[PDB]
Enzyme design. Structure first.
Site, PDB file in Angstrom:
ATOM      1  N   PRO A 107       5.411   5.396   4.681  1.00 28.77           N
ATOM      2  CA  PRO A 107       4.105   5.025   4.123  1.00 28.77           C
ATOM      3  C   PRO A 107       3.803   3.560   4.377  1.00 28.77           C
ATOM      4  CG  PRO A 107       5.742   5.369   2.388  1.00 28.77           C
ATOM      5  CD  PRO A 107       6.332   5.903   3.652  1.00 28.77           C
ATOM      6  N   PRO A 108       2.543   3.219   4.646  1.00 28.38           N
ATOM      7  CA  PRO A 108       2.184   1.809   4.836  1.00 28.38           C
ATOM      8  C   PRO A 108       2.457   0.997   3.577  1.00 28.38           C
ATOM      9  CG  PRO A 108       0.475   3.234   5.709  1.00 28.38           C
ATOM     10  CD  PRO A 108       1.412   4.115   4.934  1.00 28.38           C
ATOM     11  N   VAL A 125       5.509  -0.544   3.099  1.00 26.56           N
ATOM     12  CA  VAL A 125       6.952  -0.705   2.929  1.00 26.56           C
ATOM     13  C   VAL A 125       7.513  -1.856   3.746  1.00 26.56           C
ATOM     14  CG1 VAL A 125       7.292   1.729   2.395  1.00 26.56           C
ATOM     15  CG2 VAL A 125       7.471   0.931   4.764  1.00 26.56           C
ATOM     16  N   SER A 146       6.507  24.819  -4.437  1.00 29.81           N
ATOM     17  CA  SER A 146       7.506  24.078  -5.201  1.00 29.81           C
ATOM     18  C   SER A 146       7.347  24.253  -6.704  1.00 29.81           C
ATOM     19  CB  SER A 146       7.439  22.593  -4.843  1.00 29.81           C
ATOM     20  OG  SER A 146       6.221  22.020  -5.285  1.00 29.81           O
ATOM     21  N   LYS A 178      10.048  13.418  -5.755  1.00 25.90           N
ATOM     22  CA  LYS A 178       9.979  14.205  -6.982  1.00 25.90           C
ATOM     23  C   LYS A 178      10.864  13.605  -8.069  1.00 25.90           C
ATOM     24  CE  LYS A 178       8.534  18.794  -5.473  1.00 25.90           C
ATOM     25  NZ  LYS A 178       8.153  18.563  -4.053  1.00 25.90           N
TER      26      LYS A 178
HETATM   27  N1  ADP Z   1      11.292  -7.014   1.946  1.00 29.12           N
HETATM   28  C1  ADP Z   1      10.141  -7.617   2.327  1.00 29.12           C
HETATM   29  N2  ADP Z   1      10.095  -8.944   2.580  1.00 29.12           N
HETATM   30  C2  ADP Z   1       8.955  -9.554   2.959  1.00 29.12           C
HETATM   31  N3  ADP Z   1       7.783  -8.914   3.116  1.00 29.12           N
HETATM   32  C3  ADP Z   1       7.682  -7.582   2.894  1.00 29.12           C
HETATM   33  C4  ADP Z   1       8.885  -6.844   2.479  1.00 29.12           C
HETATM   34  N4  ADP Z   1       8.517  -5.558   2.331  1.00 29.12           N
HETATM   35  C5  ADP Z   1       7.195  -5.480   2.626  1.00 29.12           C
HETATM   36  N5  ADP Z   1       6.696  -6.683   2.965  1.00 29.12           N
HETATM   37  C6  ADP Z   1       5.288  -6.960   3.344  1.00 29.12           C
HETATM   38  O1  ADP Z   1       4.507  -5.771   3.209  1.00 29.12           O
HETATM   39  C7  ADP Z   1       3.661  -5.579   4.348  1.00 29.12           C
HETATM   40  C8  ADP Z   1       3.679  -4.115   4.770  1.00 29.12           C
HETATM   41  O2  ADP Z   1       2.922  -3.931   5.964  1.00 29.12           O
HETATM   42  P1  ADP Z   1       3.058  -2.560   6.799  1.00 29.12           P
HETATM   43  O3  ADP Z   1       2.800  -1.408   5.859  1.00 29.12           O
HETATM   44  O4  ADP Z   1       4.350  -2.600   7.581  1.00 29.12           O
HETATM   45  O5  ADP Z   1       1.830  -2.632   7.836  1.00 29.12           O
HETATM   46  P2  ADP Z   1       1.348  -1.307   8.615  1.00 29.12           P
HETATM   47  O6  ADP Z   1       0.677  -0.480   7.545  1.00 29.12           O
HETATM   48  O7  ADP Z   1       0.412  -1.827   9.680  1.00 29.12           O
HETATM   49  O8  ADP Z   1       2.628  -0.710   9.146  1.00 29.12           O
HETATM   50  C9  ADP Z   1       4.183  -6.483   5.452  1.00 29.12           C
HETATM   51  O9  ADP Z   1       3.119  -7.278   5.979  1.00 29.12           O
HETATM   52  C10 ADP Z   1       5.227  -7.370   4.805  1.00 29.12           C
HETATM   53  O10 ADP Z   1       4.833  -8.741   4.910  1.00 29.12           O
END
Ligand code: ADP
Ligand code: ATP
Ligand code: ADP
Ligand code: MG
Lengths: 547, 487, 158
Positions: B49-50, B52, B374, B417
C-alpha cells in the site's frame, strides 16, 4: 551513406529498385529541412530489415535431439514435431512456414521451450506479447511519415532478430482483447498467420510487402475455446499437459535445482536438496499442476541458503531435508486429503479442469432442515455454478428422483426433502457438465444414507435417460485424482480411448472404470444395498411425524 | 562496488525502522551478489500500500551499495520514441529521461526507481515497460549513438504497486514481488517519532527542542486521524501541526517551549474525526464481530441477525439479507442459513426456532460494498446466537469460510484481519486451522493479547463460544413462545 | 530586491479583497511564517483547491500585493507542443524570445510571480510544465534564446 549494407543484403529486384530510387532522391535533398530528418528516419526503419539475410538450417538429427532433451525432460510431443520438421527440411533443399501453438496450464514449460527449439533449429528467437492487445496499430503499423508513428511489432521483431527465418513465439492468443474502436487485433493476426498470405504481408509502415513464409511462428496459449475459429483454423495445436509427482521430482532435481543454484551463484558440491525434501515440499506444500510454485520455492530456499553461507564465510556445507524444511519456508500450507479422510452421506468427490490445470472439487448435498420436517420439497444450489452446471444440477435432480422411484419403490425421500447443494471453494467460479454424474451420485447417496468410498473420484456428463457422454479432457482430471489420493477413477466409456493413450505413470495407481450407463456407477458404488436395506431407510422419520 | 553485510544492515536500520523482512530480503540480495564478481542487474519489485515508504528504500539501497539514485515516472510517458532516444540533428528534439540518465550516470551499474506499475494516443506504454523490464530482451539495445557497445544489464529496476490485480500476468511471471505490509500502532509511532517529526520540524524552519509532542498526544493523533497502514496522512498532519506552530511562534516573536499534551490535545486543529472503538461493550444476541480485508487495510464488520417481530406472533419463516453483500457473500449467507438450521436439529432437537422464525441479516455500515466467503462462520454463529438467545463474549473476533458439512476453510489474508481485531478491542481471534501457517509468520508484537483458536470443524467454535448451553436448557429457550402460537 | 516579512500588513491586504475566506488567509500566513523562519521562501509552490467562481484568480494579485512583488499573468493554454514553442536557434532567421524573456523584462525584479490560468481546462504540455516547475530542473533551464543562465527555482508561481 549506408549503401554497403544494401549491396550486401542481396535484395530482390523490386525492393532494390525502390530503395535505389529512394536513395537517389535523398541524395539531392537538402539536409537543413526537418523533412530530411523524417526521410532518413524512414530509411533507418527501412534498411533495418534483412531482406536477404537468412541463417543456415541444421541437418543433424542426433544433434537436434541432444539439444532438445538437455533442456526439457517429459514434453515429448513438441520434440517429435521438431524432429519431423528437421527430417522434412533435410529431405528437401529447404522447408519453412508451419505455425505451431502450445496449449496447457501454467508451469508446464511451453514458454521455456521456445529458446530450446530456437537453439535446436539453429535459428534466432523473439518473444511477442498479445496479452494486453486491443488494437491493430502496433501489429500492422501506421503511415510512414507521421511524427508519432511507430511501425508494427512484426517488423520490429524482424529487426531485433536481424535475420530471416526467425522463431517468433506469440505469448498469448487466448488473452486477446475483444476490440472496440481503434483496431481489432484478431483480423491482423488472421492476416499474419495465413500460410499463403505471408508472401504479401503488406505492412502499413512499409508499402513494400515482406515475405513471412520462412518465419516460424510458435504460439503459446492456455485455453483453446477463447481463440476464435478463424484463427484456430490456420494454426496447428499441441496439448502440453501437466506432470506426475515422479516426473515433477525428476524435472526439479535435473533442472530446477541447478538453475536456482547458479542463479544465486553457489559453488557446486556445497549446498544441495535431498529428494525427500523436494517431494515433501511438492506434496504437502503446493497443489498447482505445473512446476512454477516449486521453482519459486526452490529459488527462495536457495537465496536463504546463500544468505546463510555468506554470513559465515559446525559445517561448511548446507543440507536441506525433512528435519530442517520448516526453517526455510515455514509451517506447511495444504494437505493431500484436505477436506476429510472419510466422507459423510451426500458428499461426492469429482474432478475438474480449469485454466490453471486439473483440480478436485467436492459436491455436498445436505438436508437444509431437521431429520424430516420440510413440509415442502425444495431444491437449492449455491456456489459459482454457472448456467451449464446449474442445468446439470437440475438434470441430476430429476434423474436421481426417477432412479430412486424406479429401483426403490417405497423410498419416498424426495417427496418431502429440502436439499441444499454446494461445491466447496465458493469463491472459485466453476462451469461445465463434467460433474453431471458427480451430482447424481450425491443426491442418491444423501437419499440412501451411505458413503461413496472416499478413495473414489468420478466425472462425466449425465443425460435424463442415464446415458453418460464424453468429457473434454481426461488426462488432467486423472492427474488431479492421483494427486488428491484417489485410487478409483470413474470416467465415461467414450473416454476409454483417451484413457488408453495416457502414459504408464499416470495410469499406475488408479483403478479404471468405464461406465456406459449410470447403472454401472450405481452397481460399483452402492453394492451392499439389498433393495430392502436401502429401501424404507426413512421409515421412522416418515411414520412418526410426516405420516 | 563492495558488498558488506554489517554496514549495509546498519545503514538500513538507520534509514528505516520496522522493515525487518524487507531488510532481510535486501541482505539476501547483497549476500547473493557477494559471491559473484558482478551483480547482473537483477530487477527487484516492491508491492505494498502507498505510504509505507517504498520510494525511500531506493536511497538506502543506493547508498548501501555506494551508488547514485535515479528516479523515473512512467505515468507521464505514453510513447516509446522518448525512450529509444533522439538524434541531435533534429532542431526540435529534446532529451528524454533515458538519454539524460545515460548522460548523467557517468558510471556503470546505475539504479533507477519506477514510480508505479498500477499507473499505466499513438502509443502504448505497456509494451515500452515490457521491453524495459524483460530480462531476455534487455540485452539487445545496441544503439548507434555510442560508438562503443553498451550493456543494459547494469540497471536495477525498482517497481511500485498497491494491488497485484493491476499487474498483467506476462509481467508478473517474469517479475519477483517483495511484499511490504503495514505498521502496527507501536511501529508507526516509533517511525513517526524517529523520522517524520524531525524532518517536518526542519521543513517548517524549526530547530529541535522548541516544540514537542507527548506520547499520548501523538498516539491519539495517529489513532483518531490516521487509519491507513501508510504514513502519508501522518506526515501531512505533522507538517500541518508544525506549520501552525511556526505561525504561532512568529506571532509570539519569542514560553518558546510549548508541549502538546492530551488534556489540550490539538483543540486548535479540531477534535477526533475517526472513531471505531466506542460502539457498544455488551453485544446483544444475534450480533457478532468479524474481520474483513480491503486495499485500505483490515476492518471489523458486524453481523446482526434479528427477528423481524417477536416469535409468539410471527409465521411463515423467511430469510432476508441486506447490506452490499454481493453474490459470494449472499451464497455464504444461504449456506449459513442451512448449516444453522441443521445444526440446531443435530444438537437441540426440541428447539424449533427456525421452524416459525423470520430472520433478518444485516452488516452495519450498509453503504460500503462487501464480498468474500471469509464471513461464512461469522454469519452461522449469529443465527445460533439469535436462536439460543446467548451472547458471544464481545471481546472475540471471528473469520473463516464455512461449508455445508460444517468445516472451516482457508481465508485470504490473516495479518490485516488480526491487526483489525487487535485495534477493535478484541482479546480472542478465531481463524481456520489451515491458516495456522500465516499465524506463525506474523510479527511477535501482534500476537500478544490475542488467544488463537484454530478450528477445522464448527464444533470447535461452538464449544469455544457456547459453553454454558446444556442439552436441557438449550432445547428449551422459547417454550412459552411456542405455547401461544400453537393454540 | 528585498522581501517583505510583515505578516500584519499581508493580513490587512488580504482582508479587504474577500469577506469571509479565512482558511486561505491563515494558510498564506503560515506560508509567510515558514518563509520568515528560513533564508528564502522555497520548498513549495502555492496552489489552491476549490470549485470555480469562489475567486481563485484575484488571489494571485492579492498575494502579489501582500508580498509586494510585481504580478504577471501567464497563459499555458496557448501552448501546442513541448518542442516548437520552447525557443529557436540563434543562428536561424526564425529566432524568437521565449515567454520567460518578456515576463522577466516586464517584471524587472527578482522572484516575479507567475499565475497559470488553466491547467485542468486545457505531445502533451505536462512535460513542459514538469520541466519548468520542478525545482530540480529550474536551476539550469537555459532557454534557447537566453544565453545567460536563468534560475527559475527562486521564481515563485501561483
Ligand atoms: N521508515 C521511514 N523513514 C523515513 N521516511 C519514511 C519511512 N516510512 C515511510 N516514509 C515516508 O513515507 C513516504 C511513502 O511514500 P510511498 O508510498 O513510497 O510513495 P508511492 O506511493 O509513490 O510509492 C515516503 O516519501 C517516505 O518519505
Ligand atoms: N520438463 C521440463 N524440463 C525443464 N524445465 C522445465 C520443464 N517443465 C517446466 N520447466 C520449467 O518450469 C518453469 C515454468 O515454465 P514456463 O513459465 O515457461 O511455462 P508456462 O507456465 O506454461 O508459461 P507462461 O507463464 O508463459 O504461461 C520454467 O522455468 C521451465 O524451464
Ligand atoms: N466574495 C465574492 N463574492 C462574489 N464573487 C466573488 C467573490 N470573490 C471572488 N468572486 C468572483 O470569482 C471570480 C473568479 O473565480 P474563479 O472561478 O476562482 O476564477 P476563474 O474564473 O479565473 O477560474 C471573479 O470574477 C470574482 O468576481
Ligand atoms: Mg500459458
Amino acid at each position: 551513406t549506408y549503401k554497403e549494407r544494401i549491396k550486401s543484403l542481396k535484395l530482390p529486384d523490386s525492393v532494390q529498385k525502390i530503395f535505389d530510387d529512394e536513395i537517389t532522391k535523398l541524395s539531392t535533398l537538402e539536409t537543413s529541412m526537418s523533412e530530411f530528418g523524417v526521410i532518413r528516419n524512414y530509411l533507418d526503419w527501412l534498411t533495418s530489415i534483412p531482406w536477404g539475410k537468412h541463417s543456415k538450417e541444421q541437418y543433424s538429427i542426433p544433434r537436434a535431439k541432444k539439444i532438445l532433451d538437455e533442456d526439457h525432460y517429459g514434453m515429448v510431443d513438441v520434440k517429435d514435431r521438431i524432429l519431423e520438421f528437421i527430417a522434412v527440411g533435410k529431405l528437401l533443399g529447404k522447408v519453412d512456414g508451419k505455425i505451431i501453438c502450445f496449449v496447457g496450464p501454467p508451469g508446464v514449460g511451453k514458454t521455456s521451450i521456445g529458446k530450446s527449439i530456437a537453439r535446436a533449429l539453429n535459428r534466432k528467437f523473439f518473444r511477442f506479447s498479445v496479452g494486453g492487445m486491443t488494437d491493430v496499430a502496433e501489429i500492422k503499423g501506421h503511415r510512414r511519415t507521421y511524427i508519432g508513428a511507430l511501425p508494427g511489432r512484426v517488423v520490429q521483431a524482424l529487426k531485433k532478430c536481424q535475420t530471416q527465418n526467425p522463431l517468433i513465439l506469440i505469448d498469448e492468443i487466448d488473452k486477446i482483447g475483444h476490440g472496440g474502436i481503434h483496431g481489432d487485433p484478431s483480423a491482423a493476426l488472421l492476416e499474419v498467420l495465413d500460410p499463403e498470405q505471408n508472401n504479401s504481408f503488406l505492412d502499413n509502415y512499409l508499402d513494400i510487402p515482406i515475405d513471412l513464409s520462412k518465419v516460424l511462428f510458435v504460439c503459446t496459449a492456455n485455453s483453446l475455446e477463447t481463440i476464435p475459429r478463424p484463427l484456430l483454423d490456420r494454426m496447428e495445436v499441441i496439448e502440453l499437459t501437466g506432470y506426475v509427482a515422479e516426473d515433477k521430482v525428476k524435472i526439479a532435481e535435473q533442472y530446477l535445482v541447478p538453475s536456482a543454484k547458479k542463479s544465486a551463484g553457489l559453488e557446486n558440491s556445497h549446498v544441495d536438496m535431498t529428494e525427500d525434501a523436494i517431494t515433501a515440499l511438492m506434496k504437502y506444500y503446493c497443489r498447482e499442476s505445473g512446476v512454477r510454485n516449486l521453482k519459486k520455492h526452490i529459488e527462495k530456499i536457495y537465496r536463504k541458503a546463500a544468505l546463510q553461507v555468506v554470513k559465515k564465510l559446525e559445517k561448511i556445507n548446507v543440507s536441506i531435508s525433512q528435519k530442517n524444511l520448516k526453517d526455510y519456508v515455514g509451517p506447511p500450507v495444504y494437505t493431500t486429503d484436505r477436506l476429510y479422510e472419510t466422507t459423510p452421506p451426500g458428499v461426492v468427490m469429482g474432478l475438474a479442469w480449469t485454466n490453471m490445470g486439473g483440480c478436485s472439487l467436492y459436491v455436498e448435498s445436505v438436508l437444509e432442515q431437521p431429520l424430516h420436517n420440510c413440509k415442502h420439497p425444495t431444491f437449492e444450489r449455491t456456489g459459482q455454478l454457472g448456467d451449464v452446471m446449474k442445468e446439470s444440477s437440475r438434470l441430476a435432480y430429476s434423474f436421481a428422483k426417477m432412479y430412486l422411484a424406479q429401483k426403490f419403490p417405497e423410498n419416498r425421500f424426495f417427496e418431502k426433502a429440502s436439499i441444499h447443494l454446494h461445491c466447496p471453494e465458493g469463491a472459485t467460479p466453476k462451469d461445465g457438465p463434467s460433474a453431471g454424474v458427480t451430482m447424481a451420485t450425491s443426491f442418491l447417496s444423501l437419499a440412501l444414507n451411505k458413503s461413496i468410498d472416499p478413495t473414489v473420484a468420478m466425472t462425466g456428463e449425465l443425460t435424463l435417460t442415464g446415458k453418460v457422454l464424453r468429457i473434454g479432457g481426461l488426462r488432467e482430471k486423472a492427474v488431479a485424482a492421483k494427486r488428491s489420493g484417489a485410487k478409483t477413477i470413474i470416467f465415461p466409456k467414450d473416454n476409454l480411448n483417451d484413457w488408453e493413450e495416457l502414459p504408464d505413470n499416470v495410469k499406475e495407481g488408479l483403478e479404471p472404470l468405464a461406465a456406459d450407463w449410470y447403472n454401472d456407477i450405481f452397481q460399483k458404488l452402492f453394492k451392499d444395498v439389498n433393495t430392502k436395506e436401502g429401501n424404507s431407510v426413512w421409515k421412522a422419520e416418515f411414520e412418526i411425524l410426516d405420516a
